[PDB]
Scaffold this active site. Structure first.
Site, PDB file in Angstrom:
ATOM      1  N   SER A   1       0.860  -1.180   0.000  1.00  0.00           N
ATOM      2  CA  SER A   1       0.000   0.000   0.000  1.00  0.00           C
ATOM      3  C   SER A   1       0.896   1.229   0.000  1.00  0.00           C
ATOM      4  O   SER A   1       1.731   1.373  -1.137  1.00  0.00           O
ATOM      5  CB  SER A   1      -0.836  -0.014   1.277  1.00  0.00           C
ATOM      6  OG  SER A   1      -1.731   1.114   1.341  1.00  0.00           O
TER       7      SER A   1
ATOM      8  N   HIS B   1      -7.382  -4.594   1.602  1.00  0.00           N
ATOM      9  CA  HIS B   1      -5.956  -4.267   1.696  1.00  0.00           C
ATOM     10  C   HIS B   1      -5.337  -4.820   2.977  1.00  0.00           C
ATOM     11  O   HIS B   1      -4.152  -5.115   2.999  1.00  0.00           O
ATOM     12  CB  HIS B   1      -5.642  -2.769   1.532  1.00  0.00           C
ATOM     13  CG  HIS B   1      -6.035  -1.917   2.694  1.00  0.00           C
ATOM     14  ND1 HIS B   1      -7.330  -1.482   2.901  1.00  0.00           N
ATOM     15  CD2 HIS B   1      -5.291  -1.376   3.689  1.00  0.00           C
ATOM     16  CE1 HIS B   1      -7.370  -0.732   3.991  1.00  0.00           C
ATOM     17  NE2 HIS B   1      -6.148  -0.653   4.486  1.00  0.00           N
TER      18      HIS B   1
ATOM     19  N   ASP C   1      -0.885  -4.371  -3.088  1.00  0.00           N
ATOM     20  CA  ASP C   1      -1.908  -3.336  -3.076  1.00  0.00           C
ATOM     21  C   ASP C   1      -1.293  -1.935  -3.059  1.00  0.00           C
ATOM     22  O   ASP C   1      -1.635  -1.114  -2.206  1.00  0.00           O
ATOM     23  CB  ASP C   1      -2.834  -3.506  -1.873  1.00  0.00           C
ATOM     24  CG  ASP C   1      -4.271  -3.797  -2.262  1.00  0.00           C
ATOM     25  OD1 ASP C   1      -4.622  -3.773  -3.454  1.00  0.00           O
ATOM     26  OD2 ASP C   1      -5.075  -4.050  -1.351  1.00  0.00           O
TER      27      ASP C   1
HETATM   28  P1  NTJ Z   1      -1.883   1.864   2.781  1.00  0.00           P
HETATM   29  O1  NTJ Z   1      -0.355   2.551   3.108  1.00  0.00           O
HETATM   30  O2  NTJ Z   1      -2.387   0.635   3.662  1.00  0.00           O
HETATM   31  C1  NTJ Z   1      -2.650   0.836   5.054  1.00  0.00           C
HETATM   32  C2  NTJ Z   1      -1.768  -0.131   5.802  1.00  0.00           C
HETATM   33  N1  NTJ Z   1      -3.061   3.004   2.449  1.00  0.00           N
HETATM   34  C3  NTJ Z   1      -4.425   2.554   2.248  1.00  0.00           C
HETATM   35  C4  NTJ Z   1      -2.703   4.411   2.330  1.00  0.00           C
END
Ligand code: NTJ
Length: 377
Positions: free
Chosen positions: A225, A303, A248
């Protein structure tokens, strides 16, 4: 032979896994990482998952919940362990491939142990960085050498951004994160080639064990992420990393300049429910006929399926808190981990049997989608 032990799954590979922490230097600009590695000893499974009260305070702040939630989280999860042997000696053997791992927004170094331990169990050393860019829910550092031996920690909590700040601070952060990934790699390589290093944390693990232990030809960067954007930034800046896997990826932080600067292979493993058109379109900007790019989507996943909190609670509560998706969390992490192993074998030239999962890179599984479910015609 294998059987359930901890809530966070043990690695599927043949090796027991050890774990330690390394901070050098002591400052807000030093390297802080959690190391997972193949170990000889198998007993202990005694690595504490979230090792400081301030991380729970940080998680509460990140969640925007009432101050008391930090205390509640600590009560619930403060004793939780992950299946790695704390400060166990490094397994002697052939030089090990190395992964540098970057955490997401609101996370910190210890929250991707399902991934780190699985990789280490298959013969990787994994360095899970803790970022000091104010993207971690919490992190710490020290004021000087004496505060390190004394242990007067300074805590740094996640920075919440106004809308007008998003548009430059996220880029500043991704550049800092890439610098931190490259600096972590340099630190590990210094230790590999025998440079003395003084851990700012006092811990049993002698870093001299790592001398001559790293396969310098087989280095990758992986991240979740914000960490997925970090993978991309890092590859664009540092050719010592031979391939990247973005879990993700959240593409917003990245500037347009990065895409043309990544000759290395890159694998996108996405959840079904996180992704959105604007993000997918930026992933597509990475595609070029002269570059190796692959993308799969895990059916029924969110995620948080990539992070350890997906294992921390029961099915019903986890689904309500969006820590779990429709898919079983072990099924999802096994797909991500096995596809990753295949991709790493292919692009690091490993002489293992991970090519048994080559079909997963192509999204050929009942619980995978080749490419994406998101439409952007
Ligand atoms: P990502 O860094 O995931 C959260 C752990 N985000 C959705 C910004």
């Amino acid at each position: 032979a294998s059987f359930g032990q901890t809530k966070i799954p043990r690695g599927n590979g043949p090796y027991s896994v050890g774990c330690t922490d390394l901070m050098f230097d002591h400052t807000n600009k030093g390297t802080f990482l959690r190391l997972y590695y193949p170990s000889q000893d198998n007993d202990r499974l005694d690595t504490l998952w979230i090792p400081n009260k301030e991380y729970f305070w940080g998680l509460s702040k990140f969640l925007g919940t009432h101050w008391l939630m930090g205390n509640i989280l600590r009560l619930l999860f403060g004793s939780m362990t992950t299946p790695a042997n704390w400060n166990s000696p490094l397994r002697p053997g052939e030089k090990y491939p190395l992964v540098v791992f970057s955490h997401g927004l609101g996370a910190f170094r210890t929250l991707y142990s399902a991934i780190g331990i699985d990789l280490a169990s298959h013969g990787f050393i994994v360095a899970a960085v803790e970022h000091r860019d104010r993207s971690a829910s919490a992190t710490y550092y020290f004021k000087d050498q004496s505060a390190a031996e004394i242990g007067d920690k300074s805590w740094l909590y996640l920075r919440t951004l106004k809308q007008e700040e998003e548009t430059h601070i996220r880029n500043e952060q991704v550049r800092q994160r890439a610098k931190e990934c490259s600096q972590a790699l340099s630190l590990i390589l210094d230790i590999d080639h025998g440079k003395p290093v003084k851990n700012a944390l006092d811990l049993k693990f002698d870093m001299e064990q790592l001398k001559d232990s790293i396969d310098r030809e087989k280095i990758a960067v992986i991240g979740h992420s914000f960490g997925g954007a970090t993978v991309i930034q890092t590859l664009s800046e540092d050719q010592r990393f031979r391939c990247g896997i973005a879990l993700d990826a959240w593409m917003f932080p990245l500037g347009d300049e990065v895409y043309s600067r990544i000759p290395q292979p890159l694998f996108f493993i996405n959840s079904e429910y996180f992704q959105y058109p604007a993000n997918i379109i930026k992933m597509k900007k990475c595609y070029s006929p002269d570059k190796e790019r692959k993308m799969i989507t895990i059916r029924g996943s969110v995620h948080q399926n990539f992070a350890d909190f997906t294992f921390a609670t029961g099915k019903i509560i986890g689904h309500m808190l969006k820590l779990k998706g429709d898919i079983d969390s072990n099924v999802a992490i096994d797909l991500s981990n096995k596809a990753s192993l295949a991709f790493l074998q292919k692009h690091l030239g490993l002489h293992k049997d991970f090519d048994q999962w080559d079909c997963l890179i192509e999204g050929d599984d009942e619980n995978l989608i080749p490419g994406t479910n998101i439409n952007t015609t």
